[PDB]
Design an enzyme around this catalytic site. Sequence first.
Site, PDB file in Angstrom:
ATOM      1  N   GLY E  29      36.022  36.000  32.060  1.00  0.00           N
ATOM      2  CA  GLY E  29      35.824  35.889  33.489  1.00  0.00           C
ATOM      3  C   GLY E  29      36.949  35.138  34.198  1.00  0.00           C
ATOM      4  N   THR E  30      36.860  35.054  35.515  1.00  0.00           N
ATOM      5  CA  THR E  30      37.916  34.385  36.271  1.00  0.00           C
ATOM      6  C   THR E  30      37.691  32.892  36.316  1.00  0.00           C
ATOM      7  OG1 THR E  30      36.614  34.913  38.189  1.00  0.00           O
ATOM      8  CG2 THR E  30      38.556  36.207  37.707  1.00  0.00           C
TER       9      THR E  30
END
Lengths: 204, 231, 195, 244, 243, 250, 241, 226, 196
Positions: E29-30
Amino acid sequence: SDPSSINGGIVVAMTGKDCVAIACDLRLGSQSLGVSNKFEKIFHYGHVFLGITGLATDVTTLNEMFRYKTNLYKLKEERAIEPETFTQLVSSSLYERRFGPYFVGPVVAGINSKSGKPFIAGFDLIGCIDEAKDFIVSGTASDQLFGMCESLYEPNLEPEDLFETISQALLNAADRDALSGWGAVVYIIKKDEVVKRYLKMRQD
Amino acid sequence: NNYDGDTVTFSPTGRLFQVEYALEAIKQGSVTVGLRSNTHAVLVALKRNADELSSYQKKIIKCDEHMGLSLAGLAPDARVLSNYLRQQCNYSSLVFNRKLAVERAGHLLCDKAQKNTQSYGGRPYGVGLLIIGYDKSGAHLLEFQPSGNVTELYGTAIGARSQGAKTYLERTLDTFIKIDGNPDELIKAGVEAISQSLRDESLTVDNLSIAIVGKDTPFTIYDGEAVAKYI
Amino acid sequence: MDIILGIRVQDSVILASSKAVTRGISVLKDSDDKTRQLSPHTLMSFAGEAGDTVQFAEYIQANIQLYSIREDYELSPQAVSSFVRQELAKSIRSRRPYQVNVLIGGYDKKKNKPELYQIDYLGTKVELPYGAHGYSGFYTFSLLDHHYRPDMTTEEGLDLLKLCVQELEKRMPMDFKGVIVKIVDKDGIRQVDDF
Amino acid sequence: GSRRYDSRTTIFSPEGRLYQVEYALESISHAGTAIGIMASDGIVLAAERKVTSTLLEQDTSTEKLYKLNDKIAVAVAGLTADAEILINTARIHAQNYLKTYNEDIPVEILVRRLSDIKQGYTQHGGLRPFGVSFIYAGYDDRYGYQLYTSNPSGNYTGWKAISVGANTSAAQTLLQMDYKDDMKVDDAIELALKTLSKTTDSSALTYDRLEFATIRKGANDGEVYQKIFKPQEIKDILVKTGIT
Amino acid sequence: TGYDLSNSVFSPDGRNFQVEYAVKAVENGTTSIGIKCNDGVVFAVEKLITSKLLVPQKNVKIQVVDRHIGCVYSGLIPDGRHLVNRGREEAASFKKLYKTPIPIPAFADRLGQYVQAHTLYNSVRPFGVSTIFGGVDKNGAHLYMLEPSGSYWGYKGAATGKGRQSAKAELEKLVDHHPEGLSAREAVKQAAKIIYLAHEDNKEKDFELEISWCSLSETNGLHKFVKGDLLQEAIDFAQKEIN
Amino acid sequence: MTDRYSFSLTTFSPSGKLGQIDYALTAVKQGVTSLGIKATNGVVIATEKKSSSPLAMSETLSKVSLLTPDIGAVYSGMGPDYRVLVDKSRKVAHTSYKRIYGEYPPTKLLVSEVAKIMQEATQSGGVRPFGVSLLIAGHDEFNGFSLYQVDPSGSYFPWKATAIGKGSVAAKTFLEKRWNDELELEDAIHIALLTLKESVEGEFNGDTIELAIIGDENPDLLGYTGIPTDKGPRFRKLTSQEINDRLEAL
Amino acid sequence: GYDRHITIFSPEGRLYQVEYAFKATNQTNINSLAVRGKDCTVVISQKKVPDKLLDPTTVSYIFCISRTIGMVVNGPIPDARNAALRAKAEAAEFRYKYGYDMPCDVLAKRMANLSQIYTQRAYMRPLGVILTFVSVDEELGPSIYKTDPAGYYVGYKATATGPKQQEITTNLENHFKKSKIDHINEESWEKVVEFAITHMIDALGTEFSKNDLEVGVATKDKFFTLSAENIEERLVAIAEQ
Amino acid sequence: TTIVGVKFNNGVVIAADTRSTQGPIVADKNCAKLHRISPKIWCAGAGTAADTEAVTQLIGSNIELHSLYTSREPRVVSALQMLKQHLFKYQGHIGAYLIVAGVDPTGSHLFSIHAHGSTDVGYYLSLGSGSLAAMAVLESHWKQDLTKEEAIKLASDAIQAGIWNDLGSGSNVDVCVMEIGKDAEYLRNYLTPNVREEKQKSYKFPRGTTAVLKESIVNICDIQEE
Amino acid sequence: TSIMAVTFKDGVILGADSRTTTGAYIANRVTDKLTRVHDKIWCCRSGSAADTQAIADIVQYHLELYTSQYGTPSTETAASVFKELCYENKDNLTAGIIVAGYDDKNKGEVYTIPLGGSVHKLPYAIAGSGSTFIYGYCDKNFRENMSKEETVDFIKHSLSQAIKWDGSSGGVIRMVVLTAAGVERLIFYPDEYEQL
């Protein structure tokens, strides 16, 4: 009118010396029309006797109910059920349906075999244990019965003395009542044998 | 693999297999594109036959009077998604007298999709949608993956060989977003976009489907003659 | 109220039921039976509440015949009487009461004895040499008790019945329009045509 | 979810057969031996209970004879556990019937109820089947003395004598030599015990390894009696036949 | 083993293998962080721009819970929107019965038991997201980061996502230069710097910065998105510091 | 969800065994040794309570539970299983009997409820069988004293005396010899300690040993003097003090 | 196979999974001591916060269950929060149905029964944690019960929990043989905190300051836990003796 | 019906009459209306005789269940709190009117409870159909710091107050004394007044006087061996 | 049944009678109508003694659970609890409950819950059957803020007017004092006040 008065019937029971005696009348009506001269309102599970009075139908249903319950017991514990015990069972089935209840008035009479004690009990519609060691009356001439016996009955009697008391007391009360008569049956229950005796009595 | 057989089992890689198999299934279907300006949104879809004598299947579903979608992937599972979307649009209008914002619909399809991949005995909905619709707050185009991620675009396409349309649309990005209140030229851009992704099957009159919803334009499907103007 | 009589003769049962079907102010129909043959050797007659009477008759007729095809052998009329009592018990506690009074007469093939039972609606089975329901009871219980001899043959019994209608007709306040009679005896179930 | 833990206890095998059901037959044949003999004048039930030391209670024993209602008994071969549940339910069923038709349940119907219960563990529900086969001894009005056996599948059939448990092979061969229709209750009692003497692997059949019960419609006029012997009436009838 | 085919069965080590797999899917994920102020909190997340075809500021990943709690997540983006849905239920129901906004150590337990729930049965799949959430009540600021274990803790700041190691470094710097806390208007600016630098490792595609804050002083305890000028200045202040 | 633990875990094996049921009887063979002897006028059941560790004191732990005023119980096997069983055992005894007959259950009926719990735990899928053997010792009015032994499969038998647990086989041949059918209450008690001392090697004191009888009625422990029809309870755990006396009589 | 992934008997006699819950316990590396006084019970647990970011006020392993009942949990923190909530509910429930605060004993027995159903059911795993409940009950005084992932328990005079618990175990054994009393005699509850902390430094050998400890004390009708100021001021009093 | 309850310094005494009435007709001259929740918690009852006796039974089992399970004496409060909840669940059809009293480890207690689920304490309470009569005598003689032997005298006279002025009070007078730290003592038939005066003559009849129709011996014994 | 509760500078003092009538005949003469639901949030029950006593425990339960998970509840919060049980079961429960409590944050607060069921914060409330006769004396003479000594008088004279004109009120007056300093019960027998 009232559910309790729709067929009449009376039951009396007394303890005596080494014997008890339970007795009803035979009459099963629908209100003022008398329907039938037969119909027993005493039944017997082992050496217990259970006489039930009042509202026509529930006498019957509530009888094949105790047939069903007594049976399952004698298969579990491998004996015959003892009156002291049986009294608790009649309360306990009754109270089960508290609302919409049965309009009955059942009366237990037998002897405890293990101790030799005579022993009677009574109930109501709702159903509570009614202790006594004298005698219990029940039904629709229950008021009328109640004085009569009290008067006659001598604390302790011989098995064939006893048979005279419960007789005259059961007769006379059914002839002062509008939904009873028509013969009567008096059982004398000893530690060995049961006699069933029909009573010669005024129709009307 | 070895973790695929259940949707329950999260793999020692860190990606759910089943959800990538769903996502694979759309790339095998018929190609479709949607693009939008500020005044109109168009859908252009390729219809396919089952053989010669078969008629052409419909990819464009009227959901209401300011929304719609197209499907690409499992057509049975599309009719289930789209019947949900029916109910929910009407629900809002009945109770609260309010057209469903295009934006709002996005979460509600995600949420229902998500729900069916975590629970056991589910499988992903193996179908992608493009949702177009013109509401109170202007034009929107949301893309529904079977993953459940809702993204708001100026253009996209999903289905087979769609990179070809993307590539084309990113050259024309600046042309068509300035085209506004010109339905005939807006539609022309979409038809040209689907020509690039095509491997054979020249656009005939019963391959092409065109839908446009707009400022004052209720959601209208064109087929038959109506798409002979835009070939 | 409809008439419905029973009488248990020395080797047969004679049931008799009213023909009149009176819904509302007018007599609709005047040839309708109110009895359903349960078994080759049981007959059940019924009257009481409008509309209930019919439903509660097939409901028993089915369930009884179902036990007869399951065992290839009909229950003794003694038992069949009890089964009815059972459902009429359960129905008085229920949300709707049924209100049907029934006479079960059947020829007991094992005992080779004809039996009759009177099951009132609350739920009471009572075996009887003879009986009735409705207002009928008031008028015929006195006529029967004068003349009924246990020894009567099937033909005395018919001739007793023909006194009992003609009675009802003098004293009743509502037409009933002559009965149908049926016999249940060891040889099957037949109908006298003569009232 | 539960895929890896699947036990599929109801699927057909390529044979046309049902595996857990065959396995239950097996179970029942390890158990102690029970035998039944129908006579024209009663029904005998004689059972051998197992794994018994002088130190185990003897007199108050029940593991093999159970009364149902006054005319019907059963003897039980297989797990004691399993068998109890199917007795409780049966007892209640017998009585239900009596409260509805005021007369006792015929032997036929009673066994037809129990067999369905057994069937229905093997239809659905993935439950394991019961480890039971009964002998039913019964007396109704429409057939007289009737003997029935039942199988853990459902299947049930009629007999003039039968056994179940261990050495049904050994037991059933002897029995085909020796049945005869005159049989009395004294003749039948004798031919019972002796079959168990030959087929017991024990050192000898003895009065501490038996449970025993008759049902005669004789004995006090026509009124059906049932006798479940005390361990002092088995010792006396083990000496009448001179096994000891 | 066979414990990797299963869900929530102890292995001989004590380990639950599934939960450790959940962490793998977070690392994909970011990057995202939360900075606890003397009197509020700030959140920021890095929104990778895939193509020139996305519309600026509509795919926002910061979902607000009630009116005074921000949630931001990394890992599988659908899972996250379900974890957040659920929190709304828990919010609204607490307020119906006790009629006060839900407290933030309350809110933390409710979510927590719900995470935790999905390791009792092996019929349901565990949540592949790590969430930073928190805000302000009458006791003040609290900040919380939630794991697929069913664990949370109180933090001074926190970080998850791809570049989280980069972030955690810089975070500690912010705690040691300010042993007395960072105040509200400043913390937005620092937020930006930690996101632009954590994106050095993810420098495959452009991004957009997105910030939010809820502070006792600035916003009246509510949450809001940073916008207008102060959004603009903080974009320019990050971009001159990494150069 | 789609919970499907419906299917029974126990199966029969090709070999006519009930695979789990056999394993459970191993878990009974490892637990701690206990015994029951029945006499003329009483029963005695006894076990050892062995500390898990030193700092622990197993006073609070009871391996002897009153069920009803007359029926006591002692177990071999798994710790927790014995406890949960006993609480359901009580609960069912007061619901399906004591309510609907006045008196407490007769001995041999209460066991039949205990067994019907244990049956279920192998029939209705999703649960492994219990891992314990119960002795249930008791006394009602009609049948005299009695003793029953309940296996985890569901089989129960009456006994004259028995043991079960760790050194069960050992203790068992030692009971066969010493038992006879004329036993004072007292003399049963002396055999119990001797027999528990062969197959135990821990410390012997009143606080690790447990003795308990079903004996006569106590009017000391009645709770309420002044009504003769009540006679008062038959179960009575033996105090610590008495045991140390009986240890001169080992 | 089948047995080494769910809760059914092995051909051994030994549920594998159940036994693995016990290895699971010791994964946080936290060591606990609980001793009794005349009027109180002390329990102390190391508090080790791994980072600068984590806040030290929220790291705990002591939970307050009712007025009179504190509990220290040993093991993975998800399970702990599940035990805590569940404990609380029970606490509440009892007090409402019979109208008096649930004595400690009853609560301990309740989570043991509740443990038990988790191992017999097939679809629930058992929770990998050991529970220690402490109180001054109303009729029994100082009390400790320690409950175990199987559902076993028993009472205690003192207890140890953790990886390195064998040191503490055997330190305590020497102490009660010597004195020949059950419980530390000292009357004050300051005093028995002091004994407790001192005895810990000596049993594991490692020194502890104000941030490495976390005290709970239970007296009659109030449970409290001590702040960093009252652990520090009590460490001062220890060095002067 | 008259049931008083008087606390004293070391305990509590609960007392009643034995007459059970049903309408104007006197059902049963004797009947202990003292029931036993648990060995140191008695309750007696007033109102509908079925509905106490059933509900005294049911909260007995559960307290008897509950007392083993927590392995300590049961506490008065608990029985009381249970009753209070069970009665309140039916909106007061169960016509219970119970005095529950008892001792335990935490001291003496004495409560009253009316059908709807109301609950009071007091040091001297009374219920039944005489109760007003009893209640009077109490409010004068009762004082603080009673002994045992005095307090029983106060109780009997308050019942006797019942006997004389209430119609539904008659016959024998039961008591039951509970004192802290001993066993409780049941003193059935503690006061017997109004013994039945003798009859003027016997009423025994002659054997053979009542005419019978016919007889049978109907044997209930199970089918015999032969 | 006369219950009132009045605010002052330092907290809030709750004051009640102890008679419990049922028609002509007085049932109990010393009834505690002042009940603890937290440890520093007390209540007054009026109306049908059954319906409040049942509620009184169920409120005591929700709160005890909220303590153990969230910390103390403000008086405001507790008042809401009474709300959501009275609003839903309004058909068949007829309850007038006054909830007063002393937070150290905002001092004494009173809420009354009339029979409909709604919250209302007030700086003094009066409720019950007997209280209608004392509406006027209370309103005129209530000073905002008082010393602990004065209040004890403002409530003594109030309740004594109530006792006097109502048949359903008497006995002794119980007062409960909620401050920071703890909880003090005060009690005034009939001779101390019917002469005043």
